[PDB]
Amino acid sequence: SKFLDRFRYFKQKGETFADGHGQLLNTNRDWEDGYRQRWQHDKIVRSTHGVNCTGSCSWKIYVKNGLVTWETQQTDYPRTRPDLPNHEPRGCPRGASYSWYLYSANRLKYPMMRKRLMKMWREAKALHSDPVEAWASIIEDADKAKSFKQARGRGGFVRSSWQEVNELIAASNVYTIKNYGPDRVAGFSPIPAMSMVSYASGARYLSLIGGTCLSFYDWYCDLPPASPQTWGEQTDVPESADWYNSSYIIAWGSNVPQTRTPDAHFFTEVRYKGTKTVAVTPDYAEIAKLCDLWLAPKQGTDAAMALAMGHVMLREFHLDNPSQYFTDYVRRYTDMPMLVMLEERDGYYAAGRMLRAADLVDALGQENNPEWKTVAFNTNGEMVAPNGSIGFRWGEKGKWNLEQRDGKTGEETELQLSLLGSQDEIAEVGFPYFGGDGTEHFNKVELENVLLHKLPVKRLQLADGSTALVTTVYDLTLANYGLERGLNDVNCATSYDDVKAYTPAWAEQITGVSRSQIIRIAREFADNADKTHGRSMIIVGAGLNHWYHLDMNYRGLINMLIFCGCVGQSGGGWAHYVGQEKLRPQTGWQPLAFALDWQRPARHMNSTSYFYNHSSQWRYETVTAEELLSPMADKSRYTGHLIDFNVRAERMGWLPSAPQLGTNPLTIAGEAEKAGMNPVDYTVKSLKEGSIRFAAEQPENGKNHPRNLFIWRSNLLGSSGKGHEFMLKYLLGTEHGIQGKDLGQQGGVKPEEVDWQDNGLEGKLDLVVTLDFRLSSTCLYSDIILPTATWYEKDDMNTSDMHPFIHPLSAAVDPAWEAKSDWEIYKAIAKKFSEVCVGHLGKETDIVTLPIQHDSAAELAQPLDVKDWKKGECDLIPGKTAPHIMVVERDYPATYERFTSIGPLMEKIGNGGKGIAWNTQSEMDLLRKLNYTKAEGPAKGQPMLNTAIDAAEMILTLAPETNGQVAVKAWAALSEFTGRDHTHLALNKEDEKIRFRDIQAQPRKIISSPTWSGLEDEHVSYNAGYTNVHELIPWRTLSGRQQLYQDHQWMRDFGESLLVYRPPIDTRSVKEVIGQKSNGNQEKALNFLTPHQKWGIHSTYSDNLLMLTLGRGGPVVWLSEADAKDLGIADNDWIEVFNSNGALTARAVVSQRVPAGMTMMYHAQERIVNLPGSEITQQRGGIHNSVTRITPKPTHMIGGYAHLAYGFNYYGTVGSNRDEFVVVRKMKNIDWLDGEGNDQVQES
């Protein structure tokens, strides 16, 4: 009895202590069980997060009372070497809050459908027993179609059932495919590495039926085009543990503590080993807190600082006191010694294309692909075609390597770098200079648009009898940097203080960073690299990569690393981290995701061109190609709207298309038959004649737009979608907040390749279907919302660029309410489709266009210039001057049996990627045993793909990263090309086979694979480019080396054959609207930056109460104190940010760490929480992408050219966004537009 215990008062007194200051008591403490019983739980399950953070962290999911209650990090990753910190615990704050979603008030529990669409669907079914015809009756009635498209984002969702929505979805897909074409059906899902099977689910269904799979890396602007330009690689970088092997690190535009949270300790800890660190960010960012020095260049001007640093480096470590390590490194691993041909101009010369073996008389003894092999001089003044150029990759074998050897005699050679001191004469070459251009918001430095430099040249006698002047990439590079070499070049610097084409004094003006800092750090960095043989590294992120001229910021950082021999050495190099792009077991996953086990090829599309086109953002373009050309280019040969350059790129097979042709591609074969020709030929003839046209030419004619769109693992309409208001108007057909006039309304110049119409087609999408676990902004604007399983309710796999482990997502409990995993949702759709299509689609024949692919022999397309067959400049040759034209048979009724079995092509054809292929029979045999096989039907005898686990096991068994047997066959295939053995890279692990159940017990390190260029080894960490440098495997570029010189016609004409400073672009989005809708408060134009947020991963977790409570309770925008004070804004005041593209409402965060002139609305806060109505649009306030708009760049459209050839997520236009400016002002009326009568007015 507790009452009776009170009487033992005296009895429970023990000894006093500390001279009477204390008393020890012997009393009951049973109450302590109250907190013990909270901690106790039922079990813990291993899982992870399928979100785009790069974290890839394994967690312990605690189930208590039969419900998921919280999570804590797993700490059992395989430990790293003794001299390196281990990875545990990883984790981040967004991840720690995921459990909140399972039973929260925003969880999606049941399939939902817009009420108006449901009422019509049911009324249509009462009149049309066949669901395809019921869908026809609604969609072909303009009034019916419009009544549900205008209801999008306007309430009225009603509970439906899996049966009802699956039938509608299937009926609509059949109708669309039958009447317009398979490519009018599309799907958008990103980053498969965060949840492989979950991505594969929709991609596989779409691929089987012919629908388009939209890309994401380029669209999100995570793809750095500079990587494919320099290395012929999408992205490959060192792992975070490798930062610990570096002795000098610059974090440049990368907010490590905030955006690479679970890996940040490698950066803080390596400092204790004596590594110096430098932060380069315009604001006082979190990353500055961890470095030894904070440099703050004006945002957008980083390339200028990088050029000046490179200048110092070349001056001091290449010229004045030649570094043995650096010199030998650039001689062997760059295109510096390669020869460039000079073009005659009026009184001077311009750098032309690189000299090819084919240009010389004997073609240098080169019989195979001589026009694709580059040329250098050896140290004995003789010409040579060295091993490794792209011409040696195809049509022959054993010479595609970086052995410094003569491509004809096979003898060892030594390349000479500079002609200086052996030139026949000095020629003057003009270099473009854009540093004097720019807007009023950035400092400029006037010199001349063309800068003349004296280059040492050598005249050569060409094969066609003509003669020509050549110089090396090296010499051209030193001139471009402005290094005086004794020829008394007036445009070369006489000192670092000489304001010239590109000095420390020059950069100080452009960037505002003190020239002595530029000099001191360039020096320290190069010295460190010289001493350690390359252990200097630069970690770089979206702070630099999301600018329109991202390529110049990157090539500047990249040249610094190259000149110091850091790329390819553990502890050194280019460390680009953005989204989670590294799905390690790539070739095991690709066949599953795009049904390549059944049909080849699939329909990949590059999303930036896709949305620029279909959401009609081109109808508002303000940037012209003309204003981006080199001052040395023939302006007349580059006329047209930016969209015209895309259409041309498409018809030349450079970039993919979607929809592809203006006619239903399921009908072409039938017509070819009647005309007496095979489909390919009939298509080419029709294309030459114009009876068949590329759909891109007429995007608004009613048959060339996408009609059904699947969205999953994406919040496209609240996060990533640049030009939000354009998507609402043109794709959705709903009210929108665009403020400006289009090309037509301003009487501007119409495109020359695309039809124009004054009243643009709106509401193009007939059906928007979104799969999610929370009601996101995208769900809010969809027609059908399907409840999906959270990451703690399904099995899947996850990998990342940051570490080498593969680990799983697992179901701690079955999905709650009526939710289903993505895999099960698409399997059920595939199943209903299969029956609904009977009688409408059978065994069909599809004509599919495929662009020329990087890593295929076809990459050797147009060697010396650009010829447009439509201009009659050449014949239409699919696969060379136009896209390949492929025939694909589809068995529509068998879609489900196919989706659920591993197809016969793996056995018939085999597997492969990155230009190599291998036999995979033994794996298919293993798979029949692990997954069991179909007992009957179309796929009888094939391994099954019924569960997500069967799908994961297929990924693991097929990939070389997870199956040592495959790894050895893959390295063997590569060895054929290089003539060097690489199998030794995986022999020691040939017996390794990673299994799904084993990774649930402990995450497993993957195996060294040719798919990648770094090693998974116990003595050296993973470092990108390590195999090129150490195994002599070439980079997949024209020259086989790191390419400093971009000689493609378009690269030359757009002024980017060599890196150069390019000021931020003018989007011209503010001057036409500022002051037009005054609310009485002052307005001011500011640079609108959107770095990634601390309280969410993109928009995921943005609605999470934990994150909202630790942040500022909803959408906010940061402003400097000076700008806020100028505008009368106090901390937390409601403000409105707007421009031509649209408007957004938010609260201000006022701060000293934001420099005057810029504002930061951290990347994505989206549209569902705490947003009042806009005074500009009189609609709900918009989001950050309500003020952006897609503007493509031509250089990112280049195809058919070795390293500049297409690949899904490998190349294509990018969704850059940092150059944007907006008008900012304090709001006055705060109306919530909800009929609650709870509105406010902000005074003054």
Partner: protein, 509 residues
């Protein structure tokens, strides 16, 4: 002399990345209930700032901690025993819900249920978790000042700027910020225990964790004022107070706290400290507040000293606890290397959660600078965080121990760079700060590599000692409601018996 043990904690601020993961896991586990939804047992503040609750460091305002009277005696700043009771009907210093923030939620269901034909896009507005009413605007939150969120003149009211010429720090180029994660200090001389009229708060003997007994607390709410770190939060629903419990359910079996094991930055260390409980009052009442730090170090005993070992045993400290104390990372950082310092020792509570101060990028200067004593690496005098600010935070204003800590960390870096880049031995920086090479290498092992087994050396709390573990193993957890737990007397009005006990006595002796 009475030896007691406790698992202490050291947080290396130099490595803190200000991510708050520690705060989210702690909240999910311990304070997601109505009544404490606004309470963050572990919370992280960005400095300069006033923190949570606002200006909690201002003791003239909040009356937390101890004062040393003129006669040499200790008294809670709140008042002596009668002064305290005289304030019981309405604690005049009590922080109100607004000094923390009004907890809020959002109407997400409106996104799901909005009616067809809505004039505008539906949205989820804020609602108070105290009243259930619509909030026109969210005006505050627990981490409102995160990353210098707010005007400098507002953030600079930070009590730690006392005695500092602070204007220069409002200039963009001189900007600085750091992170201060905090939890309860589980003090040797806790002010909360001393200020609770019902005696419901106690320090556990075997492991020093300080708890508020949920049976015995009566809700007098004076402890909240008494705690100078403002780490006791009133549960507005139950009417009782609650605080960080140092995850005793895990510590009891030798596991790290949740906020420690989940620390992404790998900055937290857990290790045993042996202390002389009889010396507590003497140290906490030393006359000069600048001596409290060293006087506390003096109460910590050397675990490898056989005199201490024999006394510990005599005083009941379990052998595995003595052994863990001998490999304690906390003892190395606070006693040997002198890197860890207490948080606000001047409150006189003898805090048991210490901090290694952070390094920072160098200050703005006329040029790129020169090589200093540390070559291309920084010299302590060039760091941009004013050392006096750190000293106000950790050493009662004395910069000497703060400078020694930073300098030593910088010396380790210089020595290691000589080794790993130059491939040479250079102990010059070490010699300057009094470190030996063996010490520097050990500092590097613990701070840099920081293997899991080295960050957490937590022994068991030995629940079997002086108790009956066997019947408890067999019957704990069947919570049918026997009504007999919590008291020592067996008599009970419901005429029941404890489920986890043995009531049939052995008659064979």
């Amino acid at each position: 002399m009475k030896i007691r043990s406790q698992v202490g904690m050291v947080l290396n601020l130099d490595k803190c990345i200000g991510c708050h993961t520690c705060s989210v896991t702690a909240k999910n586990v311990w304070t997601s209930r109505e009544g404490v939804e606004y309470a963050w047992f572990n919370n992280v503040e960005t400095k300069p700032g006033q923190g949570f609750p606002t200006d909690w460091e201002n003791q003239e305002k909040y009356k937390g901690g101890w004062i040393r009277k003129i006669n040499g005696k200790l008294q809670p700043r709140m008042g002596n025993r009668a002064m305290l009771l005289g304030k019981i009907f309405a604690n005049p210093h009590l922080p109100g819900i607004d000094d923390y923030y009004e907890p809020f939620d959002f109407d997400y269901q409106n996104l799901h249920t909005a009616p067809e034909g809505s004039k505008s896009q539906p949205i989820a507005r804020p609602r108070s978790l105290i009243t259930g009413e619509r909030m026109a605007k969210i005006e505050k939150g627990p981490n409102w000042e995160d990353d210098l969120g707010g005007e400098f003149d507002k953030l600079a009211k930070d009590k730690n700027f006392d005695n500092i010429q602070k204007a220069m720090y409002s200039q963009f180029e001189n900007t600085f910020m750091m992170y201060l994660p905090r939890l309860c200090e589980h003090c040797l001389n806790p002010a909360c225990v001393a200020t609770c009229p019902s005696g419901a708060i106690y320090k556990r003997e075997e492991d020093g964790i300080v708890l508020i007994d949920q049976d015995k607390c009566r809700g007098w709410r004076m402890c909240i004022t008494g705690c100078p770190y403002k780490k006791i939060y009133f549960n507005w629903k139950s009417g009782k107070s609650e605080k960080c419990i140092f995850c005793y359910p895990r510590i009891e079996a030798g596991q790290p706290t949740v906020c420690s094991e989940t620390c992404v930055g790998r900055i937290r260390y857990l290790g045993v400290l042996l202390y002389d409980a009889d010396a507590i009052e003497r140290a906490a009442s030393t006359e000069n507040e600048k001596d409290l730090y060293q006087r506390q170090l003096d109460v910590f005993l050397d675990p490898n000293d056989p005199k201490v070992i024999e006394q510990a045993i005599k005083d009941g400290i379990p052998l595995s606890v003595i052994e863990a104390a001998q490999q304690s990372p906390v003892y190395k950082m606070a006693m040997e290397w002198k890197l860890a310092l207490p948080l606000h020792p001047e409150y006189r509570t003898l805090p048991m959660v210490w901090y290694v101060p952070p390094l920072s990028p160098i200050q703005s200067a006329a040029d790129a600078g020169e090589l200093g004593s540390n070559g291309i690496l920084p010299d302590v005098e060039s760091l941009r965080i004013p050392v006096q600010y750190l000293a106000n935070l950790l050493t009662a204003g004395d910069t000497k121990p703060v400078l020694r800590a930073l300098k030593r960390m910088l010396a380790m870096r210089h020595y290691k760079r000589a080794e790993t880049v130059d491939g040479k031995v250079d102990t010059r920086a070490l010699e300057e700060v009094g470190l030996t090479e063996a010490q520097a290498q050990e500092m590097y092992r613990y701070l840099a590599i920081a293997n899991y087994e080295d960050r957490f050396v937590v022994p068991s709390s030995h629940r079997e000692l002086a108790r009956e573990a066997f019947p408890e193993k067999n019957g704990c957890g069947f919570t049918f409601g026997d009504g007999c737990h919590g008291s020592d007397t067996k008599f009970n009005l419901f005429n029941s018996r404890r489920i986890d006990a043995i009531d049939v006595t052995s008659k064979t002796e």
